[PDB]
Amino acid sequence: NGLTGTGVLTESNKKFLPFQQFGRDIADTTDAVRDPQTLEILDITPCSFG
Amino acid sequence: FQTRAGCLIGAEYVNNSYECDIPIGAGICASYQSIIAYTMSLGAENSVAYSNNSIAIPTNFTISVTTEILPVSMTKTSVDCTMY
Amino acid sequence: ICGDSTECSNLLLQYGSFCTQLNRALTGIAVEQDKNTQEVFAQVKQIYKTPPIKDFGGFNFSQILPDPSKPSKRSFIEDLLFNKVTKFNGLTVLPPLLTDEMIAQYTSALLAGTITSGWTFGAGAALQIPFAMQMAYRFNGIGVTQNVLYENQKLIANQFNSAIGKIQDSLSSTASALGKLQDVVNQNAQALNTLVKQLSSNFGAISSVLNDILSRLDPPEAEVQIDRLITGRLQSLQTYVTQQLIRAAEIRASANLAAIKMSECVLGQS
Amino acid sequence: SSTASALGKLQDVVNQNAQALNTLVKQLSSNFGAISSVLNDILSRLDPPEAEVQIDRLITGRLQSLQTYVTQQLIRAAEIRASANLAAIKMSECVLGQSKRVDFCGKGYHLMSFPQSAPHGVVFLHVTYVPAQEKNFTTAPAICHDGKAHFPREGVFVSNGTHWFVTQRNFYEPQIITTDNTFVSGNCDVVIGIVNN
Ligand SMILES: *[C@@H]1O[C@H](CO)[C@@H](O[C@@H]2O[C@H](CO)[C@@H](O)[C@H](O)[C@H]2NC(C)=O)[C@H](O)[C@H]1NC(C)=O
Ligand SMILES: *[C@@H]1O[C@H](CO)[C@@H](O[C@@H]2O[C@H](CO)[C@@H](O)[C@H](O)[C@H]2NC(C)=O)[C@H](O)[C@H]1NC(C)=O
Ligand SMILES: *[C@@H]1O[C@H](CO)[C@@H](O[C@@H]2O[C@H](CO)[C@@H](O)[C@H](O)[C@H]2NC(C)=O)[C@H](O)[C@H]1NC(C)=O
Ligand SMILES: *[C@@H]1O[C@H](CO)[C@@H](O[C@@H]2O[C@H](CO)[C@@H](O)[C@H](O)[C@H]2NC(C)=O)[C@H](O)[C@H]1NC(C)=O
Ligand SMILES: *[C@@H]1O[C@H](CO)[C@@H](O[C@@H]2O[C@H](CO)[C@@H](O)[C@H](O)[C@H]2NC(C)=O)[C@H](O)[C@H]1NC(C)=O
Ligand SMILES: *[C@@H]1O[C@H](CO)[C@@H](O[C@@H]2O[C@H](CO)[C@@H](O)[C@H](O)[C@H]2NC(C)=O)[C@H](O)[C@H]1NC(C)=O
Ligand SMILES: *[C@@H]1O[C@H](CO)[C@@H](O)[C@H](O)[C@H]1NC(C)=O
Numbered sequence: 184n185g186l187t188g189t190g191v192l193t194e195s196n197k198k199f200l201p202f203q204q205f206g207r208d209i210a211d212t213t214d215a216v217r218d219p220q221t222l223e224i225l226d227i228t229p230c231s232f233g
Numbered sequence: 234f235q236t237r238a239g240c241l242i243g244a245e246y247v248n249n250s251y252e253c254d255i256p257i258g259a260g261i262c263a264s265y266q267s268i269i270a271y272t273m274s275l276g277a278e279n280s281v282a283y284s285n286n287s288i289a290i291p292t293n294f295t296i297s298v299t300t301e302i303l304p305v306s307m308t309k310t311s312v313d314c315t316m317y
Numbered sequence: 318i319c320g321d322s323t324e325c326s327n328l329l330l331q332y333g334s335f336c337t338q339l340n341r342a343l344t345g346i347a348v349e350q351d352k353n354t355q356e357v358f359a360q361v362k363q364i365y366k367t368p369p370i371k372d373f374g375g376f377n378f379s380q381i382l383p384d385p386s387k388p389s390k391r392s393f394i395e396d397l398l399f400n401k402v403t404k405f406n407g408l409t410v411l412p413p414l415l416t417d418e419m420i421a422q423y424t425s426a427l428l429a430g431t432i433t434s435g436w437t438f439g440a441g442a443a444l445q446i447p448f449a450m451q452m453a454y455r456f457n458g459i460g461v462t463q464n465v466l467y468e469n470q471k472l473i474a475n476q477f478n479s480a481i482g483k484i485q486d487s488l489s490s491t492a493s494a495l496g497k498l499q500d501v502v503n504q505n506a507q508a509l510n511t512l513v514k515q516l517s518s519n520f521g522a523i524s525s526v527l528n529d530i531l532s533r534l535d536p537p538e539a540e541v542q543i544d545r546l547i548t549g550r551l552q553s554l555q556t557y558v559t560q561q562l563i564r565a566a567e568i569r570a571s572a573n574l575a576a577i578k579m580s581e582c583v584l585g586q587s
Numbered sequence: 588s589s590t591a592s593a594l595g596k597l598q599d600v601v602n603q604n605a606q607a608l609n610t611l612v613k614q615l616s617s618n619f620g621a622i623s624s625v626l627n628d629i630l631s632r633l634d635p636p637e638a639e640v641q642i643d644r645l646i647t648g649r650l651q652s653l654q655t656y657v658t659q660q661l662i663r664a665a666e667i668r669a670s671a672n673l674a675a676i677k678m679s680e681c682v683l684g685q686s687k688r689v690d691f692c693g694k695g696y697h698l699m700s701f702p703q704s705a706p707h708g709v710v711f712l713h714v715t716y717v718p719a720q721e722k723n724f725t726t727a728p729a730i731c732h733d734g735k736a737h738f739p740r741e742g743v744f745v746s747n748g749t750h751w752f753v754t755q756r757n758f759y760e761p762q763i764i765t766t767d768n769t770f771v772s773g774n775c776d777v778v779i780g781i782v783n784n
């Protein structure tokens with residue numbers, strides 16, 4: 184929905200309230216999203232680097 | 234091979250234990266001997282013959298000369314502004 | 318400061334070699350910490366072991382000698398100390414070279430050597446000697462004739478055992494007895510946390526996120542905004558590095574003092 | 588003479604100073620987001636309106652680089668000062684006298700020391716003493732005689748299997764037990780380990 188990101192998208196066990204749109208924890212790190220079509224919540228984590 | 238510090242490619246793990254020279258991490262460390270990797274050995278293990286009625290009195294001596302190096306000063310430099 | 322972008326990397330490439338210096342400094346301090354602990358603890362050439370039968374004239378070292386039942390091979394006091402002390406953005410944490418198990422092994426070797434041999438193993442090879450006579454020598458060192466010790470052996474042993482038990486109880490019950498290490502950990506964690514949180518500052522640009530500001534404007538203005546963000550983040554990073562350098566220097570001084578104390582008070586009478 | 592790489596500290600200090608100075612000089616060639624890294628060209632290509640902007644960018648970049656260099660120099664100077672204070676302490680304590688603190692000047696018991704110069708530091712040669720060639724023997728803490736206990740003045744009781752002697756702690760030199768080198772205090776009923784002799 185216009186939000187650009189990169190990482191692995193996996194199943195999330197969070198509990199968004201019905202009005203919620205996404206979630207972040209610290210420093211504007213979008214941790215969890217809900218898809219605009221299925222309305223199913225997923226979470227994002229960056230792929231490995233080292 | 235996989236270790237707590239990541240993984241190693243090109244080295245083969247061995248079950249021995251030597252006082253190593255190239256640290257890797259988390260106790261694991263490598264040496265050339267094909268390159269091999271192992272767990273470092275803290276040193277030779279010996280059991281002193283402790284009792285309640287025995288001592289160990291030396292009978293000879295040696296004299297040793299050792300070195301140690303300590304820096305005391307570094308080069309004195311100055312820097313201008315307008316020319317820089 | 319760029320976070321998976323090409324324009325940001327290209328713009329950063331023309332500011333010189335600040336990042337090489339930063340990486341060199343951080344690597345240097347890490348290696349310094351490793352060498353620091355290695356020189357503090359690794360003082361013995363060999364690894365001694367206590368004999369199976371323990372009769373030290375009545376003294377009781379049960380609560381400081383390693384317990385084979387515990388998988389960690391750590392004594393009671395070490396377990397108490399360990400129990401009394403309490404993720405991906407571009408930063409990493411390396412593990413220490415020496416695992417805590419080997420540190421425990423060094424500690425056990427030092428303690429066994431000082432119990433059996435005394436100060437003799439600090440100069441040449443370890444020399445066996447009964448513990449009571451070592452304690453007699455230690456009194457003779459401080460101006461009290463050994464004539465005392467042999468007439469007060471049981472009383473001295475009881476006093477020492479009571480003292481060690483009281484120390485154990487005080488550590489087990491009373492809290493806030495390890496303020497220094499906890500404070501060090503708190504300082505490091507807080508500095509890292511504020512460095513991470515600084516990443517959300519506007520710094521005078523129109524946004525604090527690279528992708529949104531890149532997918533919204535033409536390159537010519539992107540140059541200006543990326544420049545502002547880059548300079549702000551670079552300043553914050555430099556401040557963090559300087560603080561870390563100061564803290565590392567102080568910690569190194571403390572570790573040097575600790576090594577001196579270990580060498581002078583454990584391996585001999587000062 | 589033969590084995591090299593024994594003077595790592597001084598070489599590291601020299602290399603660090605040289606590298607820091609070299610990178611400080613190298614920082615001139617950077618662009619810092621300006622049009623060019625040479626002042627004359629941008630001065631000889633634009634009117635002062637934007638020329639002053641470019642000069643400002645270059646000035647602030649170079650000023651930041653100079654500040655960083657000065658800070659690093661200060662830190663290194665503090666470290667060197669601490670090291671040299673330790674060196675002065677060792678010079679005063681191990682060269683002008685005999686030290687007693689364990690493992691301060693060499694391994695083993697300290698005997699004496701010699702200083703030597705080095706291009707940016709000092710080298711100490713420590714002459715020490717190390718025992719060897721141990722034995723086993725048998726030991727007792729005190730000796731009963733006529734009902735009273737005798738203790739050694741300085742030294743320790745030993746026995747090679749049949750006879751008893753008194754020696755010093757750091758060498759083997761047995762001597763016959765005599766009233767001169769032993770002192771008496773009370774009867775022997777409290778001491779644990781007395782030997783009748
Ligand atoms: C001193 O006496 C012991 C026996 O009381 C001799 O035997 C040594 O005992 C220790 C511990 O039991 C072992 O680690 C050694 O290997 C034994 N030595 C042997 C088998 O030769 C000991 O040899 C005697 N001498 C010394 C210098 O310790
Ligand atoms: C070491 O052990 C004890 C305690 O110091 C002493 O000898 C023991 O004495 C008791 C009582 O006479 C006996 O029951 C033991 O068999 C003895 N030997 C032991 C406990 O090992 C003496 O100080 C030392 N004993 C020896 C044999 O060296
Ligand atoms: C103490 O150690 C020294 C050094 O090894 C011994 O001196 C050696 O004695 C042998 C036998 O005569 C000679 O072959 C060596 O040349 C000597 N060494 C030196 C450096 O001169 C000395 O004998 C030992 N002490 C005792 C009591 O045996
Ligand atoms: C050294 O002290 C410990 C701690 O008290 C003693 O261990 C106790 O031993 C008694 C008698 O077997 C037991 O009832 C306790 O439960 C033990 N306490 C613990 C915490 O295990 C140990 O016996 C002492 N050593 C000697 C030689 O007396
Ligand atoms: C323990 O040392 C004493 C003193 O050196 C030895 O006693 C002498 O031993 C020599 C050699 O056997 C004899 O020639 C002397 O006559 C002995 N002197 C006396 C006064 O008896 C003793 O033999 C040594 N014990 C052992 C087991 O070696
Ligand atoms: C050292 O001498 C004393 C005094 O002679 C011994 O003590 C007595 O010895 C006699 C004879 O052996 C015994 O009948 C007594 O019972 C002993 N008295 C006591 C209070 O023990 C002593 O035994 C001698 N030392 C040794 C190791 O036997
Ligand atoms: C969106 O459309 C798809 C296909 O037409 C359908 O499967 C899905 O249920 C729709 N979602 C919503 C929220 O209507």
Ligand SMILES: *[C@@H]1O[C@H](CO)[C@@H](O)[C@H](O)[C@H]1NC(C)=O
Pocket residue numbers: 246247248
């Ligand atoms: C030898 O090393 C392997 C792994 O390389 C390990 O699984 C094994 O336990 C070790 N010891 C023996 C006796 O095989």
